[PDB]
Design a protein around this nucleic acid. Structure first.
Ligand SMILES: C=C1[C@H](COP(=O)(O)OP(=O)(O)OP(=O)(O)O)[C@@H](O)C[C@@H]1n1cnc2c(=O)nc(N)[nH]c21
Ligand SMILES: [Mg+2]
Lengths: 406, 553
DNA sequence: TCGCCCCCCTTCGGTGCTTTGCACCGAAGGGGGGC
C-alpha cells in the first residue's frame, strides 16, 4: 500500500512539547511496548536532529490489567490539516445516543497496518525518560498511522468500513461510530445479550487485526429553586441573585416583585413573609426553570465547551455549551469509590464521563474549563485516566457567586 | 581517535546561510596553546585546512580546564548557532546521588576528548570555518574547518550524547546487572560482582569503547572510594557534597547576593533548614549588578543561621528499593518550607526547600499543597514513585479545607506529625448568617478617569459611613468598603457586598497577600469571632445594597 | 567574548475578562550545579 500525502496547517510547525516525569512502572511498560513496536517496524529509533516531540505516558484499565501506551498528540492534532477539506472526515450517527447500551472498544491496533507518509513521520517523535536520569531520553517516531493521531481514523476510513460492513449488514439496528481509536457500539438488547454481540464484533475484527454506557439515564439537571415555609432576607437575596443570573439564560424572568420585599436596610436573619405578588412571581419562575430553554441548537461547525463545579459530598455539576448561556446540556456527575477521599480522581473521572457523553451525542469532545489549579491537576491526573483519547482543557478559578446548579 | 559511528545529518534553518565574522586578538600563551591543539588536531584528523572559496568564518578562543594545566579550545559560534536547526535535547535531567542504590563495586570513568572523537556531518563541516590569529599583527591567520563536534556549537552536546547512547547500548543489553549512569562523557559503573569480576567487566567496557574511538585515560579512571561524581563524593555507605564556600564580604553587590543565594540553594539539597527569603528580598527593585546593597537586619540573621547550619557535617544515604520513601515537611515562616526525604529515621536521602510565592493572595494550606506537589515530582524523577508524607497539619484542618474550598484538591497518603508551627486555617467564613450580629451593606465605587473613589456602608442597626479615597481603583474601593465594615463591627458580623472580585479573594481564606490592603483585611478576619459574607447583584435596587449604593454616590 | 541540561528568585510582557486593573502564566534576566 502507498502513503496518503499529509500536511500541517499553513504556517504551523510540528509539536515541541517536553516529556514529563514517569513512574518506574510506566517507564518499564513503555520500554517493553516500544522495543516490540520497534522490532515490528511500527516505530523507529531517532536522534536529536529531529526537533519535534510529544509527551508519552501509559494507562492501565483495571479489568484489562495490561498497560496501554498513550501518546498525547493533542498539539499535533491541532496543527494537522483538516480532513473535511480533503473529504476524509467521519460522519456522526444521530441514533447512537438513542440506544440503551453502548460499549467502547479500543481498535487502535488496526492503524498499525497502514504506513504513514514518510515526510510526515518526523512530527510523531516522542521520548522515553529515564529513572533518576541514568541515561538520556530514548527517541522514537512512527512509521505507521499512530494511535491518537486524528489523521489515522480519516486515512483508515475506507478500510474500516469494509471490515465493518458484514457486521452491520447482519445487524441493521446496531449503530457503530468511530471516534479516534475507539468504536462506540450501541444497541437496545438485554444487558447479557448486548454483551454477547459485542464479543461477536470483536472476533470479526480479530480475524483481520470497556464497560456498558447507558444514554437513556443521562438525566438533565435543571436550575432548582429552594422550597421553604418561611423565608429570611438572606434567603430572598440568595434567591434573587440566582434568578438574576438565570435571566441571562431563560426568557422573561422577573424579580422586581421580590426585590422590594427587601425594601429597607434589613437584618439578614429577619423573616420576611411572602406577598401574593411575590408567591406569584416565584412559582412562575419555578415553572420556567422546570422545562428547558427554547431556541438552542447544536452547531457542528463550532467547538463544544464544558464547565464543571465541585458541589461537595462527591457531587459534580456540569454544563456543555457552544455560545455562553445557551447550554446544550446541563448535568450532575456523582461517583462513589466508597472512600470519598479524592477530589482529583473524581474530577478526572467526571471529565472522562462528560467527554464520553459528548462523543456519543455529538461526535466530538468539549474543551473543558477545569475548577482546579493547573499544577495540582498535572501532579495526579494521569493516575486516573482510562480513555485512549484526551480532550482539550484549561484551568479556571471561579469562586461561586451563586450556587446556580444546586 | 575518531569514532567510525555514522554522522548525524544536520541542517541550517531554512533561508539561512553560514556565519561570516572576523577573529579578535588573543594572547601569546593562548595562541601557542591553540597551535599545539590545532596543528595536532589536524594531525589527528580533527580539523582540515581550507581556503578562500569557503566564505564562512567564526572566531576562536581558549579557557582553562580543571584538569591541571590543560586548555580547552572553544569557538564563538553564536552566529552559526542562531542559524543552525533546532534539536530535541535528550538530556532530560540531572542524576542525583540519593537515587543510587548501594553497590558492591563502583568505577567512575571519563572519555578523553569526547566531542573530538565524534565525526561531524560532512556537508555541514564547511559552516564551521574558523581562523587561528597567532599574535594577530604578524601574518593573516590559517583557515580550518571542523571534521568533528566543535565545543561551542549548539548541536554538539545532543549529537555526542546520542552517539554515546548508541555505543553503550551492545554493552547495556549484554550486562543488565551493571548500572551505567551516563552523564555527557562521564560514566559511573556499579555492580554487585566481586571486584575481580567487576574489573573484568570494566576492562571489557573500556575495550568496546576504544573500538568505537572513545579512550578512557587513566587519570580520569577512579577505582577507589570516595568517587568524585557530579559534584558529590560517593562513599560505600554515604555521600556528601563537595565543599561549599560561601562568599564573605563587608560590602555586598547585587551580584554577590545573587551568588550567595545560588550557593545556598545548591546546599539545600543536603543541608536541612536553609532559608533564602530575606537575602533574596535584597535583590528586589535593584537596577544594576554592581549596585551596593546593605544587608538588612533580617538578612544578616538569615545569613548567620545558614552559616551555622553549613558548619555542621552532613551526609545523605543511598536508596533502598525494599523500604518505603518518606517525606516530612516543616513550616519556616513567610511562605518558606523545608523538607527531608528518608527511609530510616535520621538517615536522610536528601533534603530540600520550597519557598515560591504563587499568586497575589494565598494561604499556608495551599502552599503546603504546592510543597507536596514539588516533592512528589522530584520523587518521581529520582526514584520512580512518590513517598508517604508526614505533614504538620491536622486531619480536621485538611478536611475543613477541601470541603469548604471550591476547587478540587488533594494530598496523597499522609500522617499527621506534631512539629509546630502547625499549618492551619486562620479563619472560616460562616455558612449561614449569624443571628444577633449586625448586618453591613458595603459598597465602594471609583471613577476610572479620576482615580478618586469612595467606600461606605449602611447597617440594619442604622450605622452609616462614607470615606473618600484618592488614587484608587474600582476593585480597591470594594476591598476598602469591606475593610471598613470589619473595622467598625463587633466580633460577629454579617457583610453583604456586590463585588464578586472581593468575595472571590476572601472566600478562598487567604492568610497572606502581596497587597497591603488585602493583608489588613486578613488580620481583621483573623481577629473576628464569626463572619458571614454574602453577595448580591449591583444596581438592582435590593434593600440595603441599594441604600449604600445611593450613599456612595 | 562558547555549548547543552536541571534547580531557584525576580522581572516583564502577553492574554482575557460580560475588565478599564487584575490575576495568571511563560519566557528571560540573574545566580547555583553538572559535563
Ligand atoms: C561535555 C563535554 C565534553 C566533556 O568535557 P571534559 O571535561 O570531560 O573534557 P574532554 O572529554 O573534552 O577531554 P578530557 O576528558 O580528556 O579532559 C567535552 O568534550 C566538551 C563538553 N564540554 C565540557 N565543558 C565544556 C565547555 O565549557 N564548553 C563547551 N562548549 N563544551 C564543554
Ligand atoms: Mg572527557
Amino acid at each position: 500500500i502507498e502513503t496518503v500525502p499529509v500536511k500541517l496547517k499553513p504556517g504551523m510547525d510540528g509539536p515541541k512539547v517536553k516529556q514529563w516525569p514517569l513512574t518506574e512502572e510506566k517507564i518499564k511498560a513503555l520500554v517493553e511496548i516500544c522495543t516490540e513496536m520497534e522490532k515490528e517496524g511500527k516505530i523507529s529509533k531517532i536522534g536529536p536532529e529531529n526537533p519535534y516531540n510529544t509527551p508519552v505516558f501509559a494507562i492501565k484499565k483495571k479489568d484489562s490489567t495490561k498497560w496501554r501506551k498513550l501518546v498525547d498528540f493533542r498539539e499535533l492534532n491541532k496543527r494537522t490539516q483538516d480532513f473535511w477539506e480533503v473529504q476524509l472526515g467521519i460522519p456522526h450517527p444521530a441514533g447512537l445516543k438513542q440506544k440503551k447500551s453502548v460499549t467502547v472498544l479500543d481498535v487502535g491496533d488496526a492503524y498499525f497496518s497502514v504506513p504513514l507518509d514518510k515526510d510526515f513521520r518526523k512530527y510523531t517523535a516522542f521520548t522515553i525518560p529515564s529513572i533518576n536520569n541514568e541515561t538520556p531520553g530514548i527517541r522514537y517516531q512512527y512509521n505507521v498511522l499512530p494511535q491518537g493521531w486524528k489523521g489515522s481514523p480519516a486515512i483508515f476510513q475506507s478500510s474500516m468500513t469494509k471490515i465493518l460492513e458484514p457486521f452491520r449488514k447482519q445487524n441493521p439496528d446496531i449503530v457503530i461510530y468511530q471516534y479516534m481509536d475507539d468504536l462506540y457500539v450501541g444497541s437496545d438488547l438485554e444487558i447479557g445479550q448486548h454483551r454477547t454481540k459485542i464479543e461477536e464484533l470483536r472476533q470479526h475484527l480479530l480475524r483481520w487485526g470497556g464497560y456498558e454506557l447507558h444514554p437513556d439515564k443521562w438525566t438533565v439537571q435543571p436550575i432548582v429553586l429552594p422550597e421553604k415555609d418561611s423565608w429570611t432576607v438572606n434567603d430572598i437575596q440568595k434567591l434573587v441573585g440566582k434568578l438574576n443570573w438565570a435571566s441571562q439564560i431563560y426568557a422573561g424572568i422577573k424579580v422586581r416583585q421580590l426585590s422590594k420585599l427587601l425594601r429597607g436596610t434589613k437584618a439578614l436573619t429577619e423573616v420576611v413573609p411572602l406577598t401574593e405578588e411575590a408567591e406569584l412571581e416565584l412559582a412562575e419562575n419555578r415553572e420556567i426553570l422546570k422545562e428547558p430553554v427554547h431556541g438552542v441548537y447544536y452547531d457542528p461547525s463550532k467547538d463544544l465547551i464544558a464547565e464543571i463545579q465541585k458541589q461537595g459530598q462527591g457531587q459534580w455539576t456540569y454544563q456543555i455549551y457552544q455560545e455562553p448561556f445557551k447550554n446544550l446540556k446541563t448535568g450532575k456527575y456523582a461517583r462513589m469509590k466508597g472512600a470519598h477521599t479524592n477530589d482529583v480522581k473524581q474530577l478526572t473521572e467526571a471529565v472522562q464521563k462528560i467527554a464520553t457523553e459528548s462523543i456519543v451525542i455529538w461526535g466530538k469532545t468539549p474543551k473543558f474549563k477545569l475548577p482546579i489549579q493547573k499544577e495540582t491537576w498535572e501532579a495526579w491526573w494521569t493516575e486516573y485516566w482510562q480513555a485512549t483519547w484526551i480532550p482539550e482543557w484549561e484551568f479556571v478559578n471561579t469562586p461561586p457567586l451563586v450556587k446556580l446548579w444546586y | 581517535p575518531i569514532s567510525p559511528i555514522e554522522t548525524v545529518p544536520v541542517k541550517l534553518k531554512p533561508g539561512m546561510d553560514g556565519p561570516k565574522v572576523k577573529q579578535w586578538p588573543l594572547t601569546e600563551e593562548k595562541i601557542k596553546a591553540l597551535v599545539e591543539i590545532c596543528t595536532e588536531m589536524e594531525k589527528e584528523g580533527k580539523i582540515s585546512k581550507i581556503g578562500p572559496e569557503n566564505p564562512y568564518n567564526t572566531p576562536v578562543f581558549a579557557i582553562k580546564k580543571k584538569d591541571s594545566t590543560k586548555w580547552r579550545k572553544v569557538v564563538d559560534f553564536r552566529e552559526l548557532n542562531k542559524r543552525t536547526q533546532d534539536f530535541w535535547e535528550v538530556q532530560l535531567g540531572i542524576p542525583h546521588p540519593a537515587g543510587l542504590k548501594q553497590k558492591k563495586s563502583v568505577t567512575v570513568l571519563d572519555v578523553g576528548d569526547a566531542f573530538y572523537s565524534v565525526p561531524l556531518d560532512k556537508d555541514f563541516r564547511k559552516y564551521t570555518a574558523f581562523t587561528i590569529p597567532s599574535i594577530n599583527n604578524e601574518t593573516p591567520g590559517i583557515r580550518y574547518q571542523y571534521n568533528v563536534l566543535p565545543m561551542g556549537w549548539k548541536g554538539s552536546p545532543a549529537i555526542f550524547q546520542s552517539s554515546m547512547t548508541k555505543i553503550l547500548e551492545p554493552f547495556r543489553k549484554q550486562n543488565p546487572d551493571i548500572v551505567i549512569y551516563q552523564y555527557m562523557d562521564d560514566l559511573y559503573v556499579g555492580s554487585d560482582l566481586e571486584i575481580g569480576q567487576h574489573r573484568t567487566k570494566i576492562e571489557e567496557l573500556r575495550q568496546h569503547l576504544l573500538r568505537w574511538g572513545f579512550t578512557t585515560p587513566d587519570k580520569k579512571h577512579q577505582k577507589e572510594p570516595p568517587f568524585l561524581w557530579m559534584g558529590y563524593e560517593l562513599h560505600p555507605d554515604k555521600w556528601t557534597v563537595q565543599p561549599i564556600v560561601l562568599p564573605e564580604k563587608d560590602s555586598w553587590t547585587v551580584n554577590d547576593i545573587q551568588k550567595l543565594v545560588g550557593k545556598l540553594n545548591w546546599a539545600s539539597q543536603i543541608y536541612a533548614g536553609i532559608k533564602v527569603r530575606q537575602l533574596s528580598k535584597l535583590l528586589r527593585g535593584t537596577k544594576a549588578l554592581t549596585e551596593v546593597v546593605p544587608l538588612t537586619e533580617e538578612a544578616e540573621l538569615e545569613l548567620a543561621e545558614n552559616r551555622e547550619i553549613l558548619k555542621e557535617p552532613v551526609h545523605g544515604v543511598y536508596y533502598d528499593p525494599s523500604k518505603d520513601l518518606i517525606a516530612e515537611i516543616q513550616k519556616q515562616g513567610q511562605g518558606q518550607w523545608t523538607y527531608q526525604i528518608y527511609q530510616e529515621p535520621f538517615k536522610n536521602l536528601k533534603t530540600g526547600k520550597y519557598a515560591r510565592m504563587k499568586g497575589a493572595h494565598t494561604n499556608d494550606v495551599k502552599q503546603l499543597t504546592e510543597a507536596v506537589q514539588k516533592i512528589a515530582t522530584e520523587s518521581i524523577v529520582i526514584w520512580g514513585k512518590t513517598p508517604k508524607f508526614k505533614l504538620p497539619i491536622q486531619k480536621e484542618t485538611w478536611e475543613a479545607w477541601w470541603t469548604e474550598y471550591w476547587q478540587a484538591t488533594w494530598i496523597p497518603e499522609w500522617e499527621f506529625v506534631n512539629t509546630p508551627p502547625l499549618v492551619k486555617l486562620w479563619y472560616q467564613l460562616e455558612k449561614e448568617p449569624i443571628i444577633g450580629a449586625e448586618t453591613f451593606y458595603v459598597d465602594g465605587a471609583a471613577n476610572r478617569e479620576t482615580k478618586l473613589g469612595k467606600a461606605g456602608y449602611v447597617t440594619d442597626r442604622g450605622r452609616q459611613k462614607v470615606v473618600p479615597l484618592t488614587d484608587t481603583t474600582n476593585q480597591k474601593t470594594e476591598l476598602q468598603a469591606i475593610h471598613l465594615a470589619l473595622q467598625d463591627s463587633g466580633l460577629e458580623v454579617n457583610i453583604v457586598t456586590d463585588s464578586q472580585y472581593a468575595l472571590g479573594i476572601i472566600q478562598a481564606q487567604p492568610d497572606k497577600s502581596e497587597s497591603e490592603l488585602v493583608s489588613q483585611i486578613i488580620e481583621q478576619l483573623i481577629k473576628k469571632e464569626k463572619v458571614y459574607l454574602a453577595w448580591v447583584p449591583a444596581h438592582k435596587g435590593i434593600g440595603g445594597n441599594e441604600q449604600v449604593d445611593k450613599l456612595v454616590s
